[PDB]
Structures are given as C-alpha cells and as structure tokens.
Write a protein that binds this ligand. Structure first.
Ligand SMILES: OC[C@H]1O[C@@H](O)[C@H](O)[C@@H](O)[C@@H]1O
Ligand SMILES: OC[C@H]1O[C@](O)(CO)[C@@H](O)[C@@H]1O
Ligand SMILES: OC[C@H]1O[C@](O)(CO)[C@@H](O)[C@@H]1O
Ligand SMILES: OC[C@H]1O[C@](O)(CO)[C@@H](O)[C@@H]1O
Ligand SMILES: [Co+3]
Ligand SMILES: [Co+3]
Ligand SMILES: [Co+3]
Ligand SMILES: [Co+3]
Lengths: 216, 152, 120, 153, 217, 119, 156, 217, 120, 151, 218, 120
C-alpha cells in the first residue's frame, strides 16, 4: 500500500472515531457520486434544442432548468443544501452562430458535478488552468476545435460559486432527431466546451489514459 | 516504432538540460527582496491563470480507490460542519505553499488537507494522528489488511 | 478550548441552498447590469479568488449572479458580511497585450464580488 | 583591488551556470510519487540539520527598525496569550512551506506569521488586514508619515 | 522608500493594539527590555565561575539559579514574570575542559539564550550554519579560526526544545591574578556561543562583514 | 468560538515555563545513563525531533524537565506532559563519513520520552 | 490602469522563476550513472531543437547593432575568401559551442565568437595574438582614444 | 559602455585584415551589398506571378531562374560571383493555393533567402519559433493572427540544407484590375515567410514590440 | 605546418554557384520522385543536419533538388564525395502523436541527403 | 534501515532547494553584462575556488574501456596526432560547460579522442558514423565486441 | 549489454589503427606500461631521503635526477623515450618539515605524477576536490582525517603546468632504527598526495567507499 | 587538404624529454627567484592555464622551473615561441578574503608563464 492509502485510512478512521461523520455518511456520499454522470446535462441541451421556451429558461435560470432533467441542485445531493463544493448556482452558457463558450476553473477544478459528473484529469491540470484563459484558440485547436475568427470565443472562469455547462449549437444533419438521439451526441467534452456535437460521435475523443495503481 | 519512441524520449529528455541561471535562495536579507519578489513570494499559489506553459498531450486518468475515498471524506467533513468548501480551498490550494502545490498530486493535497483540518480545529491531536499512522502501518505489516486496499 | 459550531451551516442552508441562503443580506447593489467597472488591485495576502490576471482591467457587468460572503471572509470562517457578486465580461485584448486583432471579439467572463469593483 | 573583486564576482556567477537535470514538477500523478519523495515533500521545512551546504563567509547584519518591532510584537502576542512560542514556531518555520521558508527573509517570516495568527484565530478578518494594508500605503503616499519609518513630509 | 515589510509591520501592530491583543505600553516595554539585553551578564557568569569553584559547580548543575548572581532571573527579569515566551526558563551552562569543547546551534531555527546573552547573530540564524555545524563542526569551527586537538571531544549542542545554552570556555593562560572585570572582558559573545575561545587582549568578536540595513535605528 | 488568552499566564506567572509543568509527567520511564534509540515516529505537519537523529542510539545524560511535547503544544494541546531527556550521540553514529581521527566528538540534544526506546 | 497591468504582467513572469522542480546538479557522474537516453541527450547536436516543447512568447523585432552588421559581414567575407565554408561555420557556431553557450549567449554573440575561433583553429592567428589584440583594444577605449565607429575620441 | 562584443568584433576584424584573410574593401563591399537587400524583389516576384500564369509556372519549377526577372541573380548579384556563402543558389518558391498554405522556418538555425528577401526577423531566429512551428503550426500561426480552414493543408517547410524558400501567397479578393505596383505593395516580408497573408490596404508587417539596440546604426 | 587552401571553393564555384558546382558528381540517384522512404537513424555524433524529429519517419520524395557533399562532410572540410539531396513531405500525424485528426492534411517538407534514406 | 532512509532523505531534499530559476533562450546582447560575458566565455576546467559541499570521497573501480581510452589517448600523442596540451584544451574546455560536468571524466577523454580524428581529418565524420553502426551491428549479430563481449 | 562508451571506444581504436595512427602493439605496450605503475618507487624515494641527507637535498632540488635512484627515469622509462605525453619530465619533490606540510591537486584537471605514483584516485579527479582544496585546505584535510598545528604552513600545490609533484612527509615518531623497507612501507599513495601522513602500523590507504565499475578487468 | 606533421614532436623530444627539449629557447628570464610579481588578468577566451583565482594577486617567485611554449600556444599547435615558467607562492589570505588569521602562514604554490607576470 502507498503512503496515500495509509493516510486516507488514518484520516477516515479518526474522523469517524471522533464523530465528525459516520461510516454510513461516507458510504452515502460515495453512492451519490456513483449516481453522477454527464447524461442529465446532455438531456438538458437536447430538450433546449427542441423547446425554445425551455432554452430561454436554461439561459436565464439554470438552477430551475436543471429540475427538468431530475437534478435539483439543492435537494438532490445528500446534504439537501447542495453539495458543499459545487453549490447551487448553475448557469447554462448558450453558444450561437456568433458565440462559442469553453469552461475552466483557473484557481482549481470547479465543475458542475451534480449535473455532469466528476471532472477530467486534464481539466484539473495546472497546464489547462494556465493556458485556456489566455490562448483559448490555440488550446482548442490542440483539442481539434476551430471556429471562425469573427466568432466570439468566450472563456468562462468558474472562480466563485457559479458552475457552468455549455449548450452547443445544434449541428447540421439532425433534422427530425428525437431527444434521445440528440442527447447522445452531446458528450462531456461538448458540455465543457472543448468539442462540439457531431452526428455519429457519441463518446469523447480518445485520449491517452493514465492507469491508477489501485483503481476500483 | 522503437525509433519514434526513442525520438520522443529524446525530445523530453533534453528539456532537463535547458540552460538557466539558477540562483539558489537561502534566507536572503530583507534588502534582497524587491516589491516584485515580495508579491511573487506572498502570492496565493492557486492563482495560475495567464502563466506561460507548454502544450501537453492531455490525458484522462483512472481513479484510485483512495482518491474516491478522499473526495467523499472531504465532502462529508463539510456536509457535517467541520468546514465549508471555501475553508477547504484556502487550506488545500493555498496554505500548502508553492512547492507542495505543484510537487504533489491533486488528491494528495486534498488528503493532506483533510488530515490538516482535523488537527487545526483540534478534533484530533497531532499525537493521535501520528499514532494512527503508526497503527495503519502495523496493521499492514502484521497481515491484518488495510480496508479495501489490502485484504488480510 | 474553543468549540466549533458544526450545525450552523446546515441549519441555515438546508432546504434553501448556498448561496440562496444569503439572499437579501447584501442590501442594495452598488452597480447594475451594463456598467463598466475596473478591477481594484486589493492586497491578496493569504487568500483571494479575484485572479491576478484581472487586476486593473476594465470589463462589463452582464449579471448580478447572487449575494454571498466574499470568499476572502468565508474561507476564514467569517460569514457576517454579505455582498453582491457580479459576472463580468472582459475583452481578451484588454487582458493580454499580445492578443491578435484577428480574434477581435474574443472575451473572458468571470465572477467578482463588489469590493473589487470601481466605476470605470 | 578591482581585479580581485571581479574574480570573486566571477566565482559566484559561474555557480548559476552549474549544469543540472532540471525536472519541473506540474502536479504529478500519485503513481509518480515514491515513498522517498512523499517523505521529502511532507517534511517539516525547519529540519535542515545534516543537509549538505557550502562554506560561506558569515556576516553580521544590522537590525532593521521593523525587525525589532516585529520581534516585540511576536513576544507581546505570546505574553498576552494569543499564542505560545511553540504555536508560533510551527506556523512560522513549518506551515509557510518550503519555498517561502528559504526564499523570504528570517524576520519576513516572523512578520507574515504574526499577521497570520491574527487571521487564523479570527481576531481580525482577512478583510480588515487587507483594508489596513491599503490604508497604510495611502498614508505613506499622502505625506502623512509612517510611524518611526517615515516622518510626515 | 518604505518597504512592504514596514507597511505590514505597522498594519499588524496597529490591528493587534486596536483589537486589544496587547497594549501600546506592552510593545514599548518589550522593546525597552530587549534594548537592555546583551552579552555582559553571561561573560560575568563565566568570569565568576573561573574565580569560584563552588559557583562553577552551580553553573554546571543549575544554570537558572546561577544566572541570578549576574542579575538575570530567567523567570522575573522579563516583563511577563514567567520568562520570555520564546526563550523559556531552563538555561544550561556547558563547561569546556582540557578534554571537552562545546559549540551551540538551533538547527530548527535560532533558539538562543537571549535573557543572558542578547540577540542572536545573523549568521547563527542562517540555514547554512544550521545545516553544517552538527555534521562538520571541526570544519565550520576552522572557518571561524578555531581548532582543537583531535583527541579533544568537540560537542555540538542543538537547542531544539526548551533549554538554552551558554558555553563556559576554559580560562586561558596569561591571565594570572586577573580581576573579575578583566576576565569577563575577554569572554565575548562568540566565546559564549562556542565559535571562538577567550584570549588575553581580545575584547571584541572577530571582525567579519557587516550587512547594512535599509533603515536601522 | 473564543480563545482563552489568560490560561498560560495564570499557570506560569511567578513560576516559569517549563517549571509550571513540574510533577505532571509522573514517573520517568528512563534514567541518566540509559542507552536509548530514537524511534522514527511519523513527522507529518510538525516535529522537533530532528530527522538526523532517527534510528540512532545515544546516552541519556540528564532528565532536564517536564513539559507538553512540542508536537502537542504547537497545536494548543497541553493536557499531556512528559519527561524530556538530554541525549549524547557519538558523531560517528550519526554521520557515516565522520573521521576516526576525531573519535571523541559528540552531539547533545533534547528529546521527549515518546521518541525513546531502550537500546 | 497601465501601471497596474504592468505589475500584473511582471508578476506572471516572475512566478515562473519559482516553478517547483527536482533540481539534480550533475558533478562529473560515473559511467554507471549514464543511461543510453542520457548519453544521446548529452551528445546531441545543440542546434537540433525542432519539436521541443516551449511556451508562447510575444515575438519581437530587434534593431540591429552596428557590431552585429559588422560581424555578419566578417563571417561572409571569411567564407568568400576561403577561410571556411558556411557549413564549417554552422558546425562550429551552432554545435561546437555546446549547450550552455548555445542558449545562454546571443545569436550574433555566437557568430562573433566563432569568427574569432576559426582564426585560431586554422592557425591564421595564434591565441596569443587574439588575447593581445583584445588587451590593446580595451586600452584604446579606456584611454579616450575612441573605438572606430563605436566610440568617438574624447576631445578638447 | 563599449561592450565586450564590440571590443571583440573590432579585434577579429583588425586581425583578419592584418593577416590578409579578407580586405578592408571586401568588408565595405559586403556591408554595402547587405544594405541593398530587402523584401521588395520577392514581393515583386509574387506580384508578377499573380499577373502572369506563365511566370508563376516558372517560379514554382525554377525559383533561381525566376528570380532573375526581379533583378536578383542568386549567382552573380552577390559580391562572390558564386552566390552568398551562407544562402547558396537554390531558391524555391512555394505556391499557396485554396487547399495549401506554406510557412517557413530553419529549425537548425536561421536559414533565410537573404538575396531576395533581406535579413531575417529577430523572432525567426528564436529557439522558440524554431522549436514550435514544425509541431504546432496552427497554434503558432494563430498567435500571429492567421487561421486557415481545417481542411486546408498547412505545410511547414524546414530550410535545413541548401534550399531557401519564399512563399507565394494566394492573391486576395478586392484586387481586381490592380497593377503590379499595387499588388507588390501588399506582399510584406511576413507574407513571404508565411506568418501572414496579403490584404488590400495593409502594406507593412503587423506591428510588434521592437527591442532597441544599445548602439544601432 | 598545415597549409589551408583558400582558393579551392572560389575557383570551382565562380560563375556557376553552389550547389550548381557539384552537378553531375553524384552519379545516378538511388530514388525517384514519388518514392516512399523512411529516414534511417544514423549516428549523429558531433554533427548532422537531418533533424532528430524525422528519424524513423516515412515520407514521400517530391523533388530531387540538387547534388552536394553531405553537410556531415562539408562541415569538416571533406568535399570528395557528392550525393543526391531530396525534398521529402511528411504527414504531420506521422511525426507528432498528438496531432489532431481535425487537421488531417497538414504536412512538413524538408531536405535529406541520400545516405539517410531507405525504401519504405 | 532507518539510518539509510535518513540519509536518502537528506540527499533528496536537496533536489527541492528553492531557487529563482531563470531559463535562458538566446537573450539579446543588451541582456549580457560584462559579468555574464566573462562567465559564459570562461574555460570550464577552471574551477578552483568555486564553492562546493563536503562529499564522502570514493575510489572507483576502473572500467576496461577507461583503461583502453587512456592508452588510446597517450598512443595518439606518442605517435604525433596531438600533444597532451591540445588534448586538454579540446577535452576539458572545448566540450563546453554542460558536457564538462554532465558526462563522466573518461567519457570526455573518449569523445575527444574521437574528436581529434575528425578535426584533423584522419577520418571523415562519415567514417566515424559508419564505424559506430558497424560496432553496433557486430554486437547485434552475436559476433562479440573486443574484450567487452565474447561472440 | 555493452554501453555507448564501449561501442565508441572500439570504434575509435579500430579507426585509429586502420588509419595507421598507432598500432595494436603500441596500444598493448602502453596498457602494459601503465599496468606496471604504482606508488612503490615514490615511497622508496621518501624512505631513502629520510636515511640520507645528501639524497634528500637532491630530491628537493632536482626530483627528476632523484627519481633515477628508485628506477623511474622520467625520460626513458615510458614507451616514448621522451617522457609520457601527459605527465612530462619535471617531477618536483615537496619536502614537509616541522613548519611546513604540503598537499597536491590539479584544479584544471587531474595532473598527477603517474610515472612514479600510478593512476590518480577517482576523488583526486573530482570537481569537488578541485574546487575546494585550494581554498579550504584545512577543512578538506580534516575530512580526510588530517589536522596540523595552526602555526604550521599548509601549502597547497596546484599542478597546472608541466610540473608534477610528490610529497615527502616528515618521518614519524616510533620508527627509530627502522630499515629503508620498513620506512617505505608506511608511505602510502595518500601520503604522497598529501591527504594523509605516514604512521607506524599503517601500510595501506584509509578505507573509503569503492564505487564498482559496470565491466572491470576480469 | 592540410598535412599534419606527426613526427616533429618525437624527433625533437626523444632522448631529451619535455620540457627539456625547449631548454635555452626563451633567452634571458625577465624575473628572478625572490621577485614579487602580480598576476595580469589577461583575456582567457578559448584557453588558459592561469587559474582565475590567481588574477590580480601578488606572490613571490620561488623557482624558475623550466622553459616551454605557453599552454595557450601549445594547445593550438603553435610552438614557435618559448618562455620562462615560474613557480609562485601566494599567501592564502591574499587569495581568499575569508581566510582566517589563525592560519596566518598558509600558502598556495603554482606555476605561471612569464607573459602573465608584472613587477609588483
Ligand atoms: O632505459 C629504458 C628501458 O628501461 C627499462 O627499465 C624498461 O624495461 C625498458 O622498456 C626501457 O626501454
Ligand atoms: O434572484 C435572481 C435570480 O432569479 C433568476 O432571474 C430567475 O430564477 C435567476 O437566474 C437569478 O439567479
Ligand atoms: O558571493 C559568492 C562567494 O564567492 C566569492 O565571490 C568568490 O570566491 C566570494 O567572496 C563570495 O563569498
Ligand atoms: O511581458 C512579459 C510577458 O510574459 C508574461 O509576464 C508571462 O506570461 C506576460 O503577461 C507578459 O506579456
Ligand atoms: Co475549482
Ligand atoms: Co531556534
Ligand atoms: Co538557419
Ligand atoms: Co590535471
């Protein structure tokens, strides 16, 4: 076992011994995290593409809009007051023919976990956090995304209590598609903003995967 | 390709040899600290936006069982009132200092800080923490296992 | 030995949320949507969530997002004061000297509490 | 001797060019941290006895007025129960972390830590400290003077 | 120009006084106390020990009690009436002999017997001295100009807990019939730290570079 | 959340530190003359038992006083008090390269009881 | 504010100096400490940098120094007149100088040092003649006599 | 303020002339030749190619022959009568098209088509440009303010041997009926390197910081 | 003792040029335009002008540019041997593992002497 | 053992010694002071007086290739390819600061023996490169390599 | 299983022989010559000097002539018959006294009196020793376990040009009536360099860590 | 190509030795035993065997050791000029500012060719 595993066990046992939180609390939180994923966010985008009134709601009040996909930022988490770290102020950023958003937390790794799941390893990297706000077009190009020079690329830095998800513009080639079909192409990367939805692409672009010493 | 692999290892290795004027600092006198250096030394480590960096091939990383447990512990400590997430961020991403901030892993900092709040708010003494670490190591050494990390 | 109140936050936020639980506590906002504001370079000793890259730059307020204690206070257990938070949009050219005129419309949006803002 | 002074400046300057395998660390994954590195990173900074170092021509240093004032402030805070000297040492010589520990001056750490205990024990909010610094800088810039450091103009 | 340190010093002191943590009088009183400190009492203790075998025994066994004879009461001389917060109340006097020579350091910081000796030298606080003395004492002492027979036990004392030390060097030759005042005069601060030994005719620490302050007193 | 700023002064005034902790450690586990080895206890966050002494054996030459361990005192925990010992180490036992020419050189420093085990 | 932005940018550049690293000084390591990877890296030809990671920098133009224009002309004239071919120059100038000087000194500084180098390596001048000429040149400057187009004589 | 470089430049030049390696006249002749160099001939070659498909074909197949039409004979224009020692005699003109856009670099140094283009820019010689362009061309070009469709082939030409290149950009819209002079005017040095494309109304390289020399001309 | 011939190059190249002066000295070329070739990783001790980033990569010959001594020889004053130089085009994805599929047509063109080439 | 871990630690923390690390990427002439000019252009073998730490000096067993390299260098001198002074200048100075301290003592002796063959044109660089390829192939084909490896 | 150094050593040697620069026999002859070298003749020179005042004077004034008495002729013993190319022919013997003690180094490299002493120690060749000895000799010597009275003149000799040195230490106490062989036995390599002084009963250099080679002689 | 004379040194030194073979080629020495001389800080570009730590210091000549070309010339194949070499003794305190007065008699002896010497 590693020094990290030894310390994790020590901290957890001490916290429980001192009654700070219980063994059941810890299991309750892990179970909650296990229920998280990018699907609710993708469904919100698909619904917005199919309902103009809902799209307006998404843009003006992300917290209220989130309820439509079953994620109540206040009552869904075990706390019943939103997760301690993600808070309760989701904002949905709507791309348009003249505007394209991409998100980062330069101070750390702030991410809309309740509606999107856990953050990618690269999103947490000092590298992404240093570069995206200053050279967004270059970083996006590395990710394989380029937009016209006149289009406004907006980088959103999640530094306070607001968390964001990007609502990309609906791509060509999806006429008559159902909500399920549309949601399927809105990947995690599209919701962060480093990729845009494309018919036929239903998973994040393949990238090197660094293996853990002891994963689940 | 074995040759391509050697080529890429080479491109990475020569970076280690990049020439520099390396000035070790050994507790300089106040007269050697300019306002520019004062601001840089007293900076909050987590504020890196805008700093120059190179292009890296971004990777995904598989989650360690201990990372998932550390995350849950940190949110449970907040859920139960030991701290708010902001107190955690300040302690975890800033108080740790420049060296540990970039030298250790992301979740390593989360974990160290979870241990830290227990001691700083006197929920456990440092002695209890040190003793517990000894206990964990002995549990492993004696073959009694360690949670889900190592079976008896 | 000091005693820590471990029930305060939950009692205040349960069923309401954070930052919803601070709603109305900041009083009247000093600025409005559309106002041009410059970021004051306040001391950053020990903690700040107002990035150095924004100091001294001017942007446009596009939304009054919510009310909350400033992180500078919340991070040290001080929640007695609550202030307005604003989402501000900066032109990239105003942050980075080298930004290309070719990408004339690029921007950066981020949140800053009222204490850091001054009318441009 | 101007030549000897140049010779000594040279001997000091070439040290900057000492070749090394310089590995920048950018939040490495847990798999990149060995036990040896874990112990080195989680070390208590003040524990330097036995570390290799070069011979230096030891010097005396005149005391700055602010250093004398800082020392008195730290002992007075202890005298009046804000902290014990051991709490100060732990915060001052260890909690500051490796970089600040050796990059900043001895009394610079004493002073930063005095400011730190005021905030950590909530005797002052960080906001009050930030505001006080702003006010102090304005006091100096206005010609109002700064204690014994600068007389009113 | 006032530095960032001077600005912060004023900010911290003003806030502490405004919040009632300590008084303006307290700060003045402490500065006054520090101003009275120096190496003279420690030097007198050594001279008195050289001239009185019974007092020397006391110095070696109970430094705190011995210190009272030179006007420094570790408990009551400081303003606190419980000893200085940082130097505590457990002074130990290390007696050199023809087979033992001591030198002191605080590898963890700069721990020094301030009540009886004054403020620590800049070099004593240096990471360099703190890294090297405990491992290469013969070499470090040689740099200071001090060498001892190879058979003599050089003992490095690391002041890491609440004990503070002063070195009582052996009385040098050439001082036959000297008065207490004459003997105390050659026991310099450096002799009390252990990086130098007393010598007739030498009444000041060895000259070394002095780094000037931006704004000294 | 209030801090008691009178505790230390009330306890130590007219007495001194560490004198104010006298008698609080009970019976000492070791005696002058005993050979003890320094246990390499975890040092996370704080310690005043130098890394250079870990695993080394020395001789106790004095029971200096009783006091809370710094590991506790530095975090505001003074409920437990233990014996402190001054220990002398042979330089050759600390530094592999120490010269046989200087065979009598030593290092003396203080260590609280928790770090000691009879050699 | 322009002054505030200037301090911000100075800050972003200054913190780079403090980037943590595992800095391993090398002091003539034994052969057993040299892996094939290290051997290839140490024996690399310095000028071959294509593909190495680097950061974005705000590219600048630079005014030409009189001495740089003179150095360039000297190097081409030496080649024109057969002292060397440009390839011999490149090899000596961009490779033989070694890693440290290759990146620590200026572009034209290397051109100039190498022009001096070919004179000595091919024995057109002895190192003694070069050292002596430098000593004499410095004297010219120090005396007030002037130095070609770089410094006029001090007058009356 | 005379620098070590100026002292050494003078030393080397005087020694070379004293030893008869090259003459004072040779040096003046080379400096004067370099003074006549610049981007105008290359810009004119591009304008002429845009205005004559047959000349464009010649430029693409035989840059050396095509160069003669703008007054730059790679063999006889230089003082040597065998081309410059460092730029050689093999100019190649790279023709951009709606599906291909070129940009040039010398990763090993600074190789540049001096006879027809003038001296290389400071940034072109930088280790930075030489490290990055061959690997992250779209990112580097974006920094310069140039972006091309993702399907367009961006080709980076690394001038590592005896060939030197100039880029013939695609003629921009808004230039119908333009004369050779008008067209040549918008083909800047940067367009010929490939870090920018010609635009009506833009007749100078994009403004960038200019680092001043201690002693320029 | 050594005497350096300072007139050789000028006598051979005057009125002709470099590399024109080496024309015809390489004999028959080993490869032709259109051929796919891989770059051999020949030892590079002391000097080379065949960039490390090309070693082991495969490209297409698009032009036989000229004949000349290899720089590896010319740079040390050895011009006895002359060989063919080829301009080769590499697909960026074949050089850099991380190159994006979005920019699938990007390439790199550079010159390499015959000694480094082998039929792919 | 605990002491072994202690000493490994003391050596490891040196890697983390804080510094103001200024990478140099071909600075302009205006960034080169006389002090830096002298430091960059000095001959690397001149180290007397430079500060350094105490190290526990060790003896080192001789590699067969080191013995052969030494003999080769003296034989080249014995037979007039160079004088020892020409060797020192090329070996301890011309190699440059980085290789001077990054590579091993005899590694420099060897690289320089190869260097003199090429610089004085006794062999072309091509012949040297070809010979290196030959040695590697001899090893790969199981033919051995002198006294270093039997067939 | 063969290093880059071994590959290059073979390439250089074969090329040199192919081009007629030196022969395989030359190389074998040199290796054999070096293999015969050692500190014995130097130790014997010191012992002879201790027993003969006139020879000692010769050692101090003309080391080259003195070396002949112990069988090492700096000009004719090496295969060249013009001295080794790298050690030259100007040996100087430095005589310690009750007021003078010498220690040697080559700050520029590793210059050592190979003909009369053998190959240099690994540490003698280290940048560390070359940086420190000339400036902190008493500290460096103390590390080696040698200390001299403060009033004694410690002289560091930096072998930077064509002169090579050996140190003639003072004869120690406890050797009354000893024979030349008995005296030579205690004059070790370290004593001849100056980092140690001769002591009765000590006939080998002080033990220190030995770094092993990857492929030493079998 | 240039021709290197590989027989010169051996023909000159065989049966005589180096530096014995240069004896008498320097003419009359400029200095003598006992003279105090200061070390000139001559340019060290490319090569020098007169250590930087000696520049500008004054020492005493204790021996005229031999005659030989300066290393600065010999190392580049130039042996036409021969000069006197001197062994010089420096007081350690004159080299190192920090040297202790306790070790008042310590010295450093090394060799320097005539070109670097000037009457003190
Ligand atoms: O006089 C010179 C001779 O001396 C003898 O001791 C050696 O064995 C011979 O190899 C050498 O030629
Ligand atoms: O209180 C103002 C808030 O209400 C909305 O306009 C509608 O729910 C939100 O987006 C905003 O945060
Ligand atoms: O400051 C660097 C150190 O090296 C010198 O400049 C030259 O030896 C010394 O005087 C100084 O102590
Ligand atoms: O001026 C120097 C340049 O580099 C930085 O300091 C750090 O990336 C920039 O903000 C600035 O523009
Ligand atoms: Co975050
Ligand atoms: Co201390
Ligand atoms: Co080039
Ligand atoms: Co040498």
């Amino acid at each position: 076992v590693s020094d990290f595993e030894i310390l994790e066990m020590a901290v957890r046992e001490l916290a429980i011994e001192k009654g700070l939180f219980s063994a059941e609390d810890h299991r309750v939180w892990k179970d909650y995290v296990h229920t998280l994923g990018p699907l609710p966010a993708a469904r919100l985008v698909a619904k917005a593409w199919l309902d103009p009134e809902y799209k307006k709601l998404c843009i003006e009040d992300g917290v209220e809009a989130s309820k439509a996909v079953g994620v109540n930022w206040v009552t869904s988490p075990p706390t019943q007051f939103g997760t301690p770290s993600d808070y309760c102020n989701l904002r949905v950023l709507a791309d348009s023919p003249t505007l394209k958003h991409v998100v980062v937390c330069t101070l750390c790794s702030c991410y809309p976990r309740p509606i999107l799941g856990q953050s990618p390893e690269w999103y947490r990297s000092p590298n992404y956090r240093r570069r995206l706000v200053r050279w967004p077009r270059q970083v996006l190009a590395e990710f394989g995304l380029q937009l016209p020079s006149e289009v406004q690329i907006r980088v959103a830095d999640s530094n306070q209590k607001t968390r964001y998800i990007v609502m990309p513009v609906r791509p060509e080639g999806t006429d008559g598609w159902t909500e399920d079909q549309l949601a399927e192409i809105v990947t995690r990367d599209c919701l962060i903003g480093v990729a845009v939805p494309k018919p036929g692409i239903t998973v994040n672009a393949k990238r090197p995967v660094l293996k853990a010493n002891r994963p689940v | 390709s074995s040759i391509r692999e050697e080529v890429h290892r080479h491109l990475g290795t020569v970076a280690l040899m990049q020439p520099a004027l390396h000035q070790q600092t050994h507790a300089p006198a106040p007269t050697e600290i300019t306002h520019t250096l004062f601001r840089a030394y007293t900076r909050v480590p987590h504020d890196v936006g805008g700093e120059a960096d190179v292009p890296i091939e971004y990777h995904e990383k598989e989650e360690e069982i201990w990372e998932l447990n550390t995350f849950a512990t940190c949110e449970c400590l907040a859920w139960r009132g030991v701290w708010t997430a902001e107190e955690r961020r300040r302690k975890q991403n800033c108080d740790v200092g420049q060296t540990v901030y970039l030298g250790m892993p992301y979740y390593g900092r989360w974990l160290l800080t979870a241990a830290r709040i227990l001691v700083d708010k006197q929920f456990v003494t440092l002695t209890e923490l040190h003793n517990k670490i000894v206990e964990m190591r002995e549990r492993v050494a004696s073959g009694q296992g360690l949670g889900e990390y190592l079976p008896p | 030995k000091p005693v820590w109140d471990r029930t305060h936050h939950a009692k205040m936020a349960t069923g309401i949320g954070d930052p919803q639980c601070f709603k109305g506590m900041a009083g009247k906002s000093k600025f409005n949507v559309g106002d041009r504001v410059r970021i004051k370079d306040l001391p950053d000793l020990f903690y700040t969530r107002t990035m150095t890259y924004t100091r001294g730059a001017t942007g446009t307020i596009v939304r009054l997002v919510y009310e909350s204690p400033a992180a500078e206070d919340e991070a040290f257990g001080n929640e007695e004061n609550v202030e307005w938070f604003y989402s501000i949009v900066f032109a990239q050219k105003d942050l980075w000297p080298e930004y290309s005129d070719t990408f004339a419309n690029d921007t950066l949006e981020t949140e800053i509490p009222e204490r850091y803002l001054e009318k441009a």
